Design an enzyme around this catalytic site. Sequence first.
Site, mmCIF file in Angstrom:
data_model
loop_
_atom_site.group_PDB
_atom_site.id
_atom_site.type_symbol
_atom_site.label_atom_id
_atom_site.label_comp_id
_atom_site.label_asym_id
_atom_site.label_seq_id
_atom_site.Cartn_x
_atom_site.Cartn_y
_atom_site.Cartn_z
ATOM 1 N N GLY A 78 41.305 56.974 48.319
ATOM 2 C CA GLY A 78 42.027 57.891 47.458
ATOM 3 C C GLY A 78 41.376 57.954 46.096
ATOM 4 O O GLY A 78 40.155 57.809 45.952
ATOM 5 N N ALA A 79 42.199 58.161 45.071
ATOM 6 C CA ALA A 79 41.667 58.135 43.716
ATOM 7 C C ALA A 79 41.256 56.725 43.324
ATOM 8 O O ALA A 79 40.249 56.535 42.638
ATOM 9 C CB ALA A 79 42.694 58.693 42.733
ATOM 10 N N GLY B 148 40.442 53.910 45.383
ATOM 11 C CA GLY B 148 39.281 53.422 46.110
ATOM 12 C C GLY B 148 38.025 54.212 45.794
ATOM 13 O O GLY B 148 36.934 53.644 45.684
ATOM 14 N N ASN C 108 49.664 48.265 44.116
ATOM 15 C CA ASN C 108 50.761 47.886 43.242
ATOM 16 C C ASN C 108 51.916 47.333 44.069
ATOM 17 O O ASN C 108 51.839 47.223 45.295
ATOM 18 C CB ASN C 108 51.180 49.081 42.387
ATOM 19 C CG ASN C 108 50.128 49.439 41.351
ATOM 20 O OD1 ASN C 108 49.534 48.553 40.734
ATOM 21 N ND2 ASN C 108 49.876 50.727 41.175
ATOM 22 N N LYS D 30 52.785 43.809 36.284
ATOM 23 C CA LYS D 30 52.476 45.213 36.522
ATOM 24 C C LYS D 30 53.725 46.000 36.898
ATOM 25 O O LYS D 30 53.818 47.197 36.594
ATOM 26 C CB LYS D 30 51.406 45.333 37.611
ATOM 27 C CG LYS D 30 50.928 46.753 37.889
ATOM 28 C CD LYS D 30 50.366 47.405 36.641
ATOM 29 C CE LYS D 30 49.245 48.380 36.977
ATOM 30 N NZ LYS D 30 49.711 49.558 37.763
ATOM 31 N N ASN E 159 55.089 49.959 36.361
ATOM 32 C CA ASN E 159 55.229 50.870 37.493
ATOM 33 C C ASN E 159 56.687 51.214 37.763
ATOM 34 O O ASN E 159 57.003 52.350 38.127
ATOM 35 C CB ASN E 159 54.592 50.271 38.743
ATOM 36 C CG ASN E 159 53.104 50.485 38.793
ATOM 37 O OD1 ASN E 159 52.340 49.549 39.016
ATOM 38 N ND2 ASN E 159 52.675 51.727 38.574
#
Lengths: 312, 309
Positions: free
Chosen positions: A12-13, A15, A106, A194, A198
């Site tokens: 995706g964005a 990786g 995440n 994190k 998120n």
Amino acid sequence: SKQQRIGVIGTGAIGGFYGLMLAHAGHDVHFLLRSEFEAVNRAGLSLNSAVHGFRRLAPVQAYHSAQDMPPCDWLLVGAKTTGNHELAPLIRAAAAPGAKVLLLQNGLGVEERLRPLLPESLHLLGGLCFICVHRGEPGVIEHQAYGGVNLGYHSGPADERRRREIVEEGAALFRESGLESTAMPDLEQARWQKLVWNIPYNGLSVLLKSSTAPLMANADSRSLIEAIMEEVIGAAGACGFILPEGYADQLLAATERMPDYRPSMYHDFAHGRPLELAAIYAAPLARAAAAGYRMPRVEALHQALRFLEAQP
Amino acid sequence: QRIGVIGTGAIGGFYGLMLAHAGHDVHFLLRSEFEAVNRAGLSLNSAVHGFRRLAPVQAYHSAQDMPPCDWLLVGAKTTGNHELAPLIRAAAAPGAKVLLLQNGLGVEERLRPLLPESLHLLGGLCFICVHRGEPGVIEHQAYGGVNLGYHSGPADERRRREIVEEGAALFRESGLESTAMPDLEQARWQKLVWNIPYNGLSVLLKSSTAPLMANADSRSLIEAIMEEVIGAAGACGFILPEGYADQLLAATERMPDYRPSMYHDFAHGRPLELAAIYAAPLARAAAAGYRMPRVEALHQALRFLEAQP
């Protein structure tokens, strides 16, 4: 640092970005494309970056089946946690002996849920990515800000000294690539940290149909974000992980500096992709409940997000 | 006696029409551009009470043209109450009863400094599904009962009860369910248990009562919000009936699909009744040291949405 052969599982964005950045640092990077192989292999991989300028990987070493991939020293899992149950055969097919599996994902408890299906000879690490990045046009990665990766070790055949060494190897890989990176002593602590970003931002951006700039500009949404942050911070401490001084205001400030950003969960909702509610909301809620610690806002936000997903 | 309707919206239109249809002398103040429906009349499309038409309707363009009224129904949104105080005053007979058929908390207390102390100020909590769908027409979907309570005025306790009973008798004799309540603030808290989850979530989740009830996650959220409101009521000294949530959830279960007043307001760009329904209960609960995290959060989201383009 010797040339590593790096496999990217799910491009995706996330990786795509890290795989491209490592490839540009001279590493031998091989991309497993679940959904978009035909598009990317002839289009290539391009990066529009306010930080690193424009970059391009063409031709890309692209694959549609994990069995065609060469044995990799590092496996970067940038795919979403929603497909972590079919990940293991892909990781196993692409792993060199003793390979390092780095989940660029995440949420909470991700590594523990994948370990049962990974051979004991593989190292399992987590990477918490603080990055503003998303898929633009096909074969294009839009990078607006940040990019740092906090790495931590979860499990594998390494003793304590070797664990630190391996986490430091991964951090040096990203640092060599011009990226910020930090070895974390406690992956679980780092995952709770994190979540403080998120949990409010991903969910409120979907629920309020807004991005980070209007969310920080409005006083009521900003007060809500802080209140939710204090629930996550309180849940972490209740579960045994006490987070640093004024951590809320630190991410308040970093997000204030942040350009107008649509969190990955926003994009997911817009495109009909299932939300990562299990890892980001359900799991920390279940942990806090075991500790007897109530998260009313997070619980309500999670109920709202589930409702929205169920609506036509 | 003589009845006036200050702000003949959906609420005032429904109760004024029902009372006038029952033979009471009712005078409607048409404050909007709707006094062009002067001669056309007022009509009611009720799934409960049927089709009723009032012809002709004693309408007035301004409050001084209105005769002195012994009862004044105020059914308009609470945000505009201060602007209505002069109109209430002009239309009031000596010792008239002002009935705020309005939702929220603290509504009467905020109006009381603007009214003569010789007026009786009452609150009417209306559990009703109703709206103004087409000009001069009132669409009534379900329920309609009014819990009346006394707030302020020059009446002793015995006169208080007699006036609340007289008001309840007005609605009963028109065919409506009506209940005299001994504590207006407690009755206001009871209504908050419904308005707080359903008004807010209808806007926030862009939904109506039926899908909010059909989905298990929103159903769970509504009940958790209801328990926050119930809990806040007790903190302030008001014990609500046992199993009130299940009773409200059951009434709404059987309710036809309904967009609350706040939903329609948001959709048409009207300011939302956030002060009386969210800000006031949160401030009261805060004064009693009792936190309502979901309601507080719900209120923050609603405020964010209003500020958004």
